[PDB]
Amino acid sequence: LTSARSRIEDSDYATEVSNMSRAQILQQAGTSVLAQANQVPQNVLSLLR
């Protein structure tokens, strides 16, 4: 019963850790890209000038 409980309940790092990887990678890429978007209307303004 302990084995059955363990297999139903336990989490596998060999999956969750790479899930964390993908997620945080996306977080950092998202931060950089978000920074990028602000420059666009700044260019718009410089053009307006």
């Binding site: 790092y13 850790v17 790479s18 990887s21 990678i25």
Partner: protein, 47 residues
């Protein structure tokens, strides 16, 4: 019965060692993909 019990527990402890070695083989897989992810961060800040 003593001989039987000892023999039965021997392989059990050995496969416990094997299971922990599995958890830590995958731990090293995760550190290796984390190194790959640090290299990804490398490309990302080079951007």
């Amino acid at each position: 019965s003593l001989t039987k019990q000892y023999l039965s527990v021997s392989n059990s402890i050995d496969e416990t060692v094997a299971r922990y070695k599995a958890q830590f083989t995958q731990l090293d897989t995760m550190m290796s993909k984390l190194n790959n992810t640090s290299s990804y961060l490398t490309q990302q800040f080079t951007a």
